[PDB]
Amino acid sequence: DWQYEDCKLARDGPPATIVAIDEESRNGTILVDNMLIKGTAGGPDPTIELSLKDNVDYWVLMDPVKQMLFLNSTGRVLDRDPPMNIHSIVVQVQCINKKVGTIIYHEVRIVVRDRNDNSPTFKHESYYATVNELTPVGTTIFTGFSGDNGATDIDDGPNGQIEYVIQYNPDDPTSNDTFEIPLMLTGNIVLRKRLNYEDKTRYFVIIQANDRAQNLNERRTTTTTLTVDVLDGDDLGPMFLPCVLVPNTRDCRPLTYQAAIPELRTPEELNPIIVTPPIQAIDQDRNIQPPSDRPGILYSILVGTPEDYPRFFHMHPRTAELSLLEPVNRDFHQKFDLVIKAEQDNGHPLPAFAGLHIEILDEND
């Protein structure tokens, strides 16, 4: 003889009614179709009363007859992302059993799902790196996107996760072929091809950040540009001077220097032996920075015919000054043919070679 049944769930499952909607759902979105509470709130002679409690900011609206809950978001959005940060809503459907005056609260919990409604945004308008031209293929040359210094995405989980990919730059076609991001979650850039400062000193890398929306179509993307400048590296040695390019090459026309020495004249009368043109070399690296790194140049006689030239000739190692060591009797020595060397003094000689011809002149020439 007991009907305390009105205001009791007509359904099975736990007391709490739990639903999920997408964030920023349209106003009038049905949050709960049918609460399935035993009793009648409507008509001539109702058995129950239904109302909402703890309806913070009135997100939720009820039709008590239909036992249906709706979203009230006229003038607003249900924003899960910062700065609103609405992850969930809880309200209470209060039910009065008019006949016995019992009270039951039906707890509704609405989980607000993340949607991929935000794009990644780069901290800086653009990025700059330098690579020494000697840097091996595989070296990491940029980690500039580390620690929120690259792109970040205000969405949650995969929707805010970021993957970095270098793109084809029509303004610089070879960029996306000289640099790569082998681990895209890091956006650390590694050299893919060997540089030559002689060929190309600046690259314009397009980098495209994308979020990891499960549905590939839903991914948002941003680009930035990373300018990379090559620094000149000690890959080249001296070149003797003067340097006159062989047509269609990067090679100096070989040089044979010229000297002529009167016979039977002393060193003190002749020294220093004038050479034509003046013996001098220069690094083929035109722009080693900083100037401290620039090697010295050592000058030497490498080989000579006849082979007794060490008796007569000395070459200053720093200056290339040639000096006669004793007078030459032309009855014994008509000439010398030497090879000269210029090499860097930094343990990376990369030497250059030139000819030096020396004529001995007869008395009364």
Binding site: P15, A20, G101
Partner: protein
């Protein structure tokens, strides 16, 4: 290009419901992922608080309950799970909603429950109000008062707990209140004198 793994469980999209009376060391669920390279996959848990509550088996991704849940303490929380293909670690949060059971009996307030009235106190006089509360959700937290056993002299309103005189008294001639919740399967009751 390596293709990073992704979780495939429905509950990343909606939520995971775990009843508060789930035994400790039981398996709540198993993480499921896909790797396009069919790389081997490693499963974990992320967070100070999460780590304590849950354990994850790395080959399969079976998830185990480490600590007692209480809906009446915390009804719900966010837990971040991870899957890694050994190129990269990929992390995704699940919403976890503790399901209520009727695990709490009602509790009387003001235990010194006593009152004395004149013998002449007429039929229909309200003489006393009992109050008990129950913190479980819905019917499990909705309290009804009755006398155990019933009294010829005194009645108690099942909803409001108001005690009123139903029989005429006579000094020369002349109580256990039972408060119960309304849970369908496992109602819980409490007595006061």
């Amino acid at each position: 290009v390596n293709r990073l793994p992704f979780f495939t469980n429905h509950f990343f999209d909606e939520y995971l419901l775990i009843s508060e009376d789930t035994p400790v060391g039981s398996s709540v669920t198993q993480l499921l992922a896909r790797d396009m390279d069919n790389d081997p996959l490693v499963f974990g848990v992320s967070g100070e608080e999460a780590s304590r509550f849950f354990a994850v088996e790395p080959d399969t991704g079976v998830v185990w309950l480490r600590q007692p849940l209480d809906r009446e303490t915390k009804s719900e929380f966010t837990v971040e799970f991870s899957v890694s293909d050994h190129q990269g670690v990929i992390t995704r949060k699940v919403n976890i909603q503790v399901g209520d059971v009727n695990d709490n009996a009602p509790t009387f307030h003001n235990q010194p429950y006593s009152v004395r009235i004149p013998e002449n106190t007429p039929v229909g006089t309200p003489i006393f109000i009992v109050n008990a509360t129950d913190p479980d959700l819905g019917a499990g937290g909705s309290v009804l008062y009755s006398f155990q056993p019933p009294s010829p002299f005194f009645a108690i309103d099942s909803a409001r707990g108001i005690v009123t005189v139903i029989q005429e008294l006579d000094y020369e001639v002349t109580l256990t209140v039972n408060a119960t919740d309304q849970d369908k399967t496992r109602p819980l009751s409490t007595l006061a004198n």
